[PDB]
Amino acid sequence: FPRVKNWEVGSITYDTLSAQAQQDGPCTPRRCLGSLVFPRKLAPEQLLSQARDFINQYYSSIKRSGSQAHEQRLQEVEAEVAATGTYQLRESELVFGAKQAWRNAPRCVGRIQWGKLQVFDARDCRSAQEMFTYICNHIKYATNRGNLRSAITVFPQRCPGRGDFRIWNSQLVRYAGYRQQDGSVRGDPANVEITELCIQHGWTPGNGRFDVLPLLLQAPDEPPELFLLPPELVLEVPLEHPTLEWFAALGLRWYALPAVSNMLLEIGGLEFPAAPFSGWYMSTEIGTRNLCDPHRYNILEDVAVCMDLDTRTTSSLWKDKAAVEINVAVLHSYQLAKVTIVDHHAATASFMKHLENEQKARGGCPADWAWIVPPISGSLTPVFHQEMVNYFLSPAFRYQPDPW
Amino acid sequence: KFPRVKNWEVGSITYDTLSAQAQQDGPCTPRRCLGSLVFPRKAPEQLLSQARDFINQYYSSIKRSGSQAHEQRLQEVEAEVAATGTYQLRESELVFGAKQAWRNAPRCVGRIQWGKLQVFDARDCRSAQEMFTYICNHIKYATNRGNLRSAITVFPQRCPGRGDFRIWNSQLVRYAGYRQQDGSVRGDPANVEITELCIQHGWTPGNGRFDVLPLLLQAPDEPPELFLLPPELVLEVPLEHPTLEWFAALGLRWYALPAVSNMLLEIGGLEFPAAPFSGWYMSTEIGTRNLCDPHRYNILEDVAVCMDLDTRTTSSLWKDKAAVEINVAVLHSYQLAKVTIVDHHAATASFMKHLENEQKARGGCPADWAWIVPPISGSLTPVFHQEMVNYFLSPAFRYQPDPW
Numbered sequence A: 001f002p003r004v005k006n007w008e009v010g011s012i013t014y015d016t017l018s019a020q021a022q023q024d025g026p027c028t029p030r031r032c033l034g035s036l037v038f039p040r041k042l043a044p045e046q047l048l049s050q051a052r053d054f055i056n057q058y059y060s061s062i063k064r065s066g067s068q069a070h071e072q073r074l075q076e077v078e079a080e081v082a083a084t085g086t087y088q089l090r091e092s093e094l095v096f097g098a099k100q101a102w103r104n105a106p107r108c109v110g111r112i113q114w115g116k117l118q119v120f121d122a123r124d125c126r127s128a129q130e131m132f133t134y135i136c137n138h139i140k141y142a143t144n145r146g147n148l149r150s151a152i153t154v155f156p157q158r159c160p161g162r163g164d165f166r167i168w169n170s171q172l173v174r175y176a177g178y179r180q181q182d183g184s185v186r187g188d189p190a191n192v193e194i195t196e197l198c199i200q201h202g203w204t205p206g207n208g209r210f211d212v213l214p215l216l217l218q219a220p221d222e223p224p225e226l227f228l229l230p231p232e233l234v235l236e237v238p239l240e241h242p243t244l245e246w247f248a249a250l251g252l253r254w255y256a257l258p259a260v261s262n263m264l265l266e267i268g269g270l271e272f273p274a275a276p277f278s279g280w281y282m283s284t285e286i287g288t289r290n291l292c293d294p295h296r297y298n299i300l301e302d303v304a305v306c307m308d309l310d311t312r313t314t315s316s317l318w319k320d321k322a323a324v325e326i327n328v329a330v331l332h333s334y335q336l337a338k339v340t341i342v343d344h345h346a347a348t349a350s351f352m353k354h355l356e357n358e359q360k361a362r363g364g365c366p367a368d369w370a371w372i373v374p375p376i377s378g379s380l381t382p383v384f385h386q387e388m389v390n391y392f393l394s395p396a397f398r399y400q401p402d403p404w
Numbered sequence B: 001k002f003p004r005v006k007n008w009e010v011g012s013i014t015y016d017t018l019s020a021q022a023q024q025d026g027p028c029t030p031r032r033c034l035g036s037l038v039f040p041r042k043a044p045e046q047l048l049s050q051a052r053d054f055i056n057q058y059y060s061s062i063k064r065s066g067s068q069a070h071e072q073r074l075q076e077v078e079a080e081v082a083a084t085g086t087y088q089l090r091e092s093e094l095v096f097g098a099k100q101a102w103r104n105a106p107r108c109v110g111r112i113q114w115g116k117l118q119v120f121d122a123r124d125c126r127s128a129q130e131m132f133t134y135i136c137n138h139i140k141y142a143t144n145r146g147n148l149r150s151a152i153t154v155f156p157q158r159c160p161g162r163g164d165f166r167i168w169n170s171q172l173v174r175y176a177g178y179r180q181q182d183g184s185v186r187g188d189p190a191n192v193e194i195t196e197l198c199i200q201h202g203w204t205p206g207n208g209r210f211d212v213l214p215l216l217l218q219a220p221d222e223p224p225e226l227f228l229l230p231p232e233l234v235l236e237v238p239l240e241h242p243t244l245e246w247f248a249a250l251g252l253r254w255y256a257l258p259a260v261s262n263m264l265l266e267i268g269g270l271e272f273p274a275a276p277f278s279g280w281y282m283s284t285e286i287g288t289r290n291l292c293d294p295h296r297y298n299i300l301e302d303v304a305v306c307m308d309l310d311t312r313t314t315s316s317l318w319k320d321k322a323a324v325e326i327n328v329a330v331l332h333s334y335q336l337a338k339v340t341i342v343d344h345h346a347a348t349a350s351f352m353k354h355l356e357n358e359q360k361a362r363g364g365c366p367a368d369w370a371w372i373v374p375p376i377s378g379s380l381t382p383v384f385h386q387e388m389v390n391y392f393l394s395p396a397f398r399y400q401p402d403p404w
């Protein structure tokens, strides 16, 4: 049982939940690989193992462990896999599993909200046109005219033989990225690859820096099909600053809905390669990483020039000053648009409360310090001084290979 | 089977082959990562194997591996460990071992400087009084009227028969911390323990916020003895802000010389419990950590209120704005006083150069991401997007328990 200390207050706890981890991480006594973005790289009796644990979890949480439906539901999954080699989740199990995978995500700082999650069950999906309608329902429900609500849509599970449902975009809303002889990029450099697949599959491109890409939706065994997103359905926020009048003229925008559409949801040994989930943004994601990363929109120096900052010496802290103002413009613009957003101080303080909750309830919480601490102003937030333990519990969201 | 390490800003990929030579083990397992823990860790034949590895390292660096001189040194050491249970370093080996310990320190962002280290050999020290003279000479040489120079003074090694030389103070320059009426702390709260000790040992305490502490110096098998630092030896910097003129009236100060004095230096199996070392400050250590940490001087809200920021809501980013200007004040003040200081942009850029040098020289570099990434503006610096591998090489600086 690892001892975990908070260096701001002096309080000590012990993480007993870590003792119950399975899927081993990347570290060994010889070396820690905690900072690696992808840990390492990405006969059916082991399906029954992960399923019996999950069903025991489910009846644990609804109190009804021992007797009744508990040691009843243990049998049909046994018989389902005995009969068919896989099994179907009950809808309440699918709901409970989706919430747990979120609760279990070590890199997610928004997990105080894990209990409020709307699960759309898309397991009877059959075509790519159907997926598109499901995705469009999700986006409409999640966006909710700017009053965002966490949501997940679970597409049919991976099957013995036969292909997989798959969204080729990394998120549901992505901006395009186009090159030149320059090798430079117009738009988002994170999305250069998928932008060229969209074109490779027939997308007439666009002119500028904020073109919402079309979706590539992959029904099982068939090639992807391009689906264009309705402009009515993609809520966006033009960026303005509350006091720097010229900021709006930079023409910056970002979208309302953060919806991750390329991770594999794993519940009770079943795999859902298409289960896009969405919540709402923390402002540093947009302001600091998407707009200021050198390999993203890289706008930092352009803003500093407009603020008349001394970009001729690092010790002026011109980068820090312009970055804060970009974050101020993000928070201001989303509030003025009445689009849900949370600043990194509010988010991290909520995550501390979540750590306290998870301590009482489960004896600890898997947390990835490098991802929980915000990318600006880290030590000004309470999670910086909190020691954390990182480990893998199931259900889980896992990374998966791109279908290329 | 060496870890692949990616830089996400640029797309670089390398493999850390040096990690495979890590000759001691840390707190992580495949089950769980403890990378974020502040304290991760906590006879003749194992002394011999450590000695042989270091001798091998020493003769590698002088392009004389395998020579007669190399093997005579190996056989000399084995003979000395057999006759006395220990051995003595040659002066050239001590200089090389001290530089290697800095080079090997995973939490140090200043390691581009590692080969430029002044080593004072104080292994002939006989008393606490001589120890004090050596320390004062170290402070004088390292400070160098504001043009700071990296240095380490090495006091006699641990040996069977006599107690250890120890410096009880955690740094050579520290400000007192006085518990108070309100139950509050006046001065530096990180230093209440050592402050209470000094008073026990006869120090007549002050009542200010920036009172420099005396040294408690322990000769073998002696109680610690109190030594006052001559005020003219301790170079200090009043803090002012280039454009916030009321900032100077806060009365804030910091000292020029960061000199860590409670770490143990390990070279070839030998242990030096007293070997204080010093460099120069990175500005975020002073501005962000020492002045803004809620458990330290905790000035952030006072500065924000003076700047007329809106401290009623976090979404105004008043904390970030106040902290940026505190860092500006530190950099301006130290430059104005002509005292060496490096900002976090310059320092992390030089660390990136260090990583590249080290990959060519040694096949990798041990680095603790959570300590290398600065506590403000993390993703604005290039180390943020660099994956790192943390592991323990010897020679090394290690933590040790407090002598009390």
Ligand code: HEM
Residues within 6 Å of the ligand: A098, A101, A102, A105, A107, A108, A109, A110, A111, A113, A117, A150, A151, A152, A277, A278, A279, A280, A281, A282, A285, A289, A342, A347, A371, A397
């Ligand atoms: C409701 C408010 C939410 C907030 C404020 C939030 C915020 C964040 C942030 C800031 C990250 C780290 C990524 C980064 O900082 O660059 C993250 C990661 C993550 N979140 Fe949340 N999120 C929310 C909802 C959700 C939901 C609903 C789910 C799933 C059901 C989820 C699952 C995840 C996962 C799996 C990761 C890891 C991403 C990766 O490994 O690339 N989050 N979230």
Ligand code: HEM
Residues within 6 Å of the ligand: B098, B102, B105, B107, B108, B109, B110, B111, B113, B117, B150, B151, B152, B277, B278, B279, B280, B281, B282, B284, B285, B289, B342, B347, B371, B397
């Ligand atoms: C010359 C300029 C130097 C700079 C700019 C520098 C910078 C730093 C910084 C910023 C940290 C982490 C402190 C923080 O929390 O912000 C650190 C840690 C450390 N430094 Fe350096 N340093 C320098 C010189 C040295 C020297 C000369 C030595 C030894 C000979 C050394 C050994 C270490 C060690 C062992 C640690 C880790 C301390 C711990 O684990 O608590 N440094 N350094």
Ligand SMILES: Cc1cc(N)nc(CCc2cc(F)cc(CC[C@@H]3C[C@H](F)CN3C)c2)c1
Residues within 6 Å of the ligand: A037, A170, A258, A259, A260, A277, A278, A279, A280, A281, A282, A285, A289, A399
């Ligand atoms: C629901 C939700 C709400 C919210 N506010 N944020 C998120 C996370 C957004 C995100 C942040 C990030 F920094 C990188 C990625 C994608 C790339 C990452 C990194 C690597 F490429 C593999 N991963 C997939 C995605 C989710």
Ligand SMILES: Cc1cc(N)nc(CCc2cc(F)cc(CC[C@@H]3C[C@H](F)CN3C)c2)c1
Residues within 6 Å of the ligand: B038, B258, B259, B260, B277, B278, B279, B280, B281, B282, B285, B399
């Ligand atoms: C030579 C030098 C130059 C420079 N510029 N900076 C430094 C770092 C100074 C420092 C920073 C820090 F963040 C923590 C500690 C000591 C405390 C650490 C943390 C925990 F309290 C126990 N350890 C002993 C010391 C050293």
Ligand SMILES: C[C@H](O)[C@H](O)[C@H]1CNc2nc(N)[nH]c(=O)c2N1
Residues within 6 Å of the ligand: A007, A384, A385, A386, A387, A388, B036, B037, B038, B370, B371, B372
């Ligand atoms: C709990 C957490 O790991 C701890 O507060 C660490 C984080 N990273 C740090 N990094 C540096 N350079 N200095 C520190 O004191 C800390 N504190």
Ligand SMILES: C[C@H](O)[C@H](O)[C@H]1CNc2nc(N)[nH]c(=O)c2N1
Residues within 6 Å of the ligand: A035, A036, A037, A370, A371, A372, B008, B384, B385, B386, B387, B388
């Ligand atoms: C190299 C480093 O581990 C990598 O850049 C990580 C660091 N922490 C991060 N944290 C978050 N939240 N998002 C990220 O993309 C990253 N990148």
Ligand SMILES: [Cl-]
Residues within 6 Å of the ligand: A258, A285, A290
């Ligand atoms: Cl994003």
Ligand SMILES: [Cl-]
Residues within 6 Å of the ligand: B258, B285, B290
């Ligand atoms: Cl310090």
Ligand SMILES: [Gd]
Residues within 6 Å of the ligand: B243, B244, B245
């Ligand atoms: Gd002024």
Ligand SMILES: [Zn+2]
Residues within 6 Å of the ligand: A027, A031, A032, A033, A034, B028, B032, B033, B034, B035
């Ligand atoms: Zn680890």
Ligand SMILES: [Zn+2]
Residues within 6 Å of the ligand: A379, A385, B288, B289, B293
């Ligand atoms: Zn701190």
